[model samples]
Target chain A: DREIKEEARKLIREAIELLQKGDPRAKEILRQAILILLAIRLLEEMEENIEKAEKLGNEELSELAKRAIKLVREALELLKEGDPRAEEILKLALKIIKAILLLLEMYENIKQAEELGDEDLSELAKIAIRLVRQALKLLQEGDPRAEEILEIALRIIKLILQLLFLKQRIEEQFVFEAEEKIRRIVEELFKLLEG
Target chain B: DREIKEEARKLIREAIELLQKGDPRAKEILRQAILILLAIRLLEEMEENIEKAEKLGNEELSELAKRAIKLVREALELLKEGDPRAEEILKLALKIIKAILLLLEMYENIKQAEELGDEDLSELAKIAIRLVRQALKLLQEGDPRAEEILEIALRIIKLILQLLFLKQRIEEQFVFEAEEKIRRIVEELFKLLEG
Candidate 1:
């Protein structure tokens, strides 16, 4: 993540140079890039805290998770504002939202699986599925290119659901698969946008 | 200060919009503006801590003052490397550095003036003068518009020195004079650069 941050910083600097040289459009793109970097950093923080929360099961960690969710919401709000590339920004936001929801669902499931009975677990799973549905609705409303993003999000959600059902026995495998899927999606999105 | 941060954030967003719209040069300018805003935020933080230090007057305050100095140095380095408007950035850095140093010097002088006799105070005055001269040298090296920046810095330094020498008796007048001088210098620099 640090290396990625360094690269993002360098890109921002280059974008600034482009603005100084009179390329106004590059400036806007660079700003978006910076925001994206910030979102990624926040997500990493959330993940770390969530991992700790799982270990300690502390109220503070739960509160931190809530704050992290709020941050994600704020990032989404910022993305919803007027932009020349509003479509692209909307698409990116959808993917980010999908990722956040998926992570939140996974965390909730792990907690429930540890504490709740089958009936409660089922209820929690139902709620998670509803969240996934809500996220899909948002993606459809916000993105013209929703199909591609949905595919990746769905794949990750499926793997997460599988792990939840298996009682977290294959958590590492699920995480690896989700990571691979996200990487591919990011690569595809980057190529499509660049071209 | 909150208003300033909001304005800075808005400007950055506008710059990003310009970049996404493919406006030539917006990217570079936006990048520069963001950096400037970040630097300003750092200064504001320093200012807040300085006020706290004035009240606290302990090891924590000393540590904070040291951190403020370090942050100012880092801000200067960033401005030197990251800004296309290098001259303006350098000027701003010099101003911040001078302000920080003056505050630090005032703290030191107050501590010593209470303990030291008349001869020691006189020697402290000489040290202050020498320190100001050294700061002037740094201003010259850091800024292309050295003469103007130095004059501005010197005026501020003098006010600080007066405040220190008077031992809290001339606090109001010192603050008023310092504010007027600093404001005028800033206005002049902005006019010189913008016009």
Candidate 2:
């Protein structure tokens, strides 16, 4: 049951030994060694968040999050096998999660717009939702084009929020909360990709 | 040589198994387990940064960073032994690194002020340096009061920077770089502590 710590300790001990010996093999091992650990942590968080979403009855979001989780899990296995390709795959998983979260929130906004009989808000949310779904599908298949699609979805969502603000259709708290979180997710996504 | 990946894989596998079994012991093991991995990553970064500082002729900064590295390594060993005390000690290691980097930079500012014969800049840098030194010493002794002293040092350093800004004593790039890095470090420190 404690194999996780046991394995991690073994990895740390051996990595230290290789680093001390100044072996060239230590380079990739050092790089991806922690990358694997990071992948596992990311996988754990994705699962936890997805479970929470499921409990909230957002089955669509939960399903999408779980899809991203599987991608990260696959990336983790690749890292264990000493595959550098895991990095790109992990990036895709991040994009998937971001898209799923944003799409889910936009769907809520769409419901509000329809109830208020606001065609402009509803139309923008619909387009954003469609683009986000496509982006998520692209990410699930490991397509690099997913990043571009996600940005387009984000742009439309931002536009919808702007109209929502002008029309005083949404609460400031809701708007700012979405802005803060989405801004953070976008920042992190680019940082991870660029790094 | 590659025992790092091998061990990490084992941990992931075992942890997944435990979570599936819904074992009670999985709680502590899961929590501290990733903490240990996170500890190792922090230790690795400390060592790499120290080496970089050494190469840049900042022997003093390098020495302090190494001290932090040692602290983190100690925490790692404690984690391996199933000791929960590792979390607090790891937080201390982060504070040490932040304090050391800031102190070393301020020491440089002190030298510049002296060369310029500006008592105002020179005086502020001096007090900040002393406070930072005391903070570092307290951290080495595992004194919780180190946080208070570190905040004092940061405040004085900020004041010094404000004067530097008005007097045009230091380049904006130098000032902003230190501010950005220190701000980020402090942000992460509190986040880790609070969480």
Candidate 3:
């Protein structure tokens, strides 16, 4: 758990730094900062295995980070090809997208914990709900497809509620349903982007 | 590896003895014994993980034994149900299925070696081809779905060839094609059974 605690502390420090920085980009940064912090907190609940961590090496971690940053850079570049307001919206959208990714990562981690019958998975699930609620609020205020996105999120939340209620059922079915919901949301988001 | 080799030798010896004895059920027992020997040989080439065997316990092993026996038993039952020739054809089909499974297991084991830049996997591939040729000979001897089944098998073989030929192509495309083919095959099988 030391690794998790360490990661949590790092995210907390980053979140605090983002909070104190007064800038026009504060909203976008705030979401990312919160996501990193939440991820760290979620990781803190799991035991660390050196071999498992080694499998996911620094190279892969850095590659993933680089890919995300490149997406942000591409969004920034696209600003010149659109309305100035689109630039601001794009920035906010990128933040929200990144936050969603982080939430998914946390969800996967917590699901693994649940598989291992960890008692703390329930608490982690609660945290995920809170994170998703905040994401929904952010999307509603900034995303052009606000209503559609919210509907999808609501459906996902319903599925999660069902899964929690039917705890004795096979976990794989829940995972499959959750994946389908996410795929639908992603397809919808891609359509919105085309528009 | 030593344990696997020893087990393989023991099973092979038992199988020869069973065939020599010519008991009332010698054919079925010989088939089972040969399948066991093939499994042990396949395991020798597979990555060693005694822990999996340990976790399975004697109960799991017994269950697998029962499954193997049931295949032969069901063939006999079919003979009593209707066709007297059912047992003869069923025996041939079981032998072919067992051989195919063994070849697949060997191919899977050696494929990993090829990933590590070893050419030893080629030998396993050759063995698989030889076994397939033998199976094809038996398959050509007329069954209700001989043509249909042979076509399906050939399609699979062709797809595997394409994959081997286009190794550098995007892996996802191959996966998509394989999934589509499998889905179609399953659908066709269901329709045939229902009809």
Relative to the true structure, how large is the alpha-carbon lDDT of every model? 0.51, 0.57, 0.42
TM-score of chain A of each: 0.37, 0.61, 0.29
Best by TM-score: 2
Q: Tens digits of per-residue lDDT for model 1 on B1-195?
A: 444445545555555434434553543444344344435534655666676567756553455356535545555555445564553544445454445545455556656566645465556545544554455455435645545545444554554455454554443354575556556655664675466
lDDT of 2 by residue, A47-127 (tens): 666666776576656766776667666665565565556666765665456556545545555566777798866666767
lDDT measured at residue A141 in model 2 versus the true structure, 0 to 100? 73
Determine which window of 10 residues in candidate 1 chain B has minimal summed lDDT: B27-36
lDDT of 3: 0.42
Which ten-residue region of model 2 chain B has the weakest summed lDDT? B186-195
Candidate 3 residue-wise lDDT, A1-195, digit = tens? 344345445544655665566554555444544543453333332213222323534343233344434444444444425455645554444454444444345454556557766432344244334434433454445545443433433343443444443343334213334433533543343343223
Which ranges in model 3 have alpha carbons more than 4 Å from their true place?
Answer: A1-70, A82-195, B1-65, B68-190
Give the range where candidate 3 chain B is weakest over 10 consecutive residues by summed lDDT.
B44-53
Q: Which candidate is the best by DockQ?
A: 2
Find the 10 residues in a row with the least total lDDT in model 3 chain A: A42-51
- Each candidate: RMSD: 21.9, 24.5, 24.5
Candidate 2 regions exceeding 4 Å error are A1-13, A16-21, A24-34, A55-59, A105-117, A157-195, B1-195
Q: Which prediction has the highest lDDT against the true structure?
A: 2
- Candidate 3: which pairs clash? none
Candidate 2 structure quality by residue, lDDT tens digits, B1-195 = 123334444565667775768776666555555655655565556556565567656565676676666766666556556555666766666666666665555655556666767653453354455556666677777777677657655655654554445345334213334433543443343333223
